[PDB]
Amino acid sequence: FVNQHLCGSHLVEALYLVCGERGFFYTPKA
Amino acid sequence: VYYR
Amino acid sequence: GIVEQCCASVCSLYQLENYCN
Fold first, then answer.
1. Which domain of life does this protein belong to (chain C)?
2. Per the structure, how many domains does chain A have?
3. Among A20, A24, C1, C7, which is least packed, fewest CB within 10 Å?
4. Distance between CA atoms of C14 and A2, rounded to whole angstroms?
5. Which residues of A, range 1-30, sit inside 8 Å of B by Cβ?
6. What is the dihedral angle through the alpha carbons of A15, A27, C6, B3, rounded to the nearest 10 degrees?
7. Which residue range is the domain that position A9 belongs to?
8. Euclidean distance between the first and final Cα of chain A, in Å?
């Protein structure tokens, strides 16, 4: 896999690409 | 957006 | 979280594995 800059909505897409059906979290510093 |  | 690496500078997709269950 490669070193990826991920702006905050496009991260949630890229995480999708990684997780499959596993389920995942977007916990930012609010 | 995307890559290093 | 990991968002304050990603939204600003690079990450690995293996950290995105860490943010799975």
1. Eukaryota
2. 1
3. A20
4. 10
5. 2-7, 10
6. 10
7. 1-30
8. 28
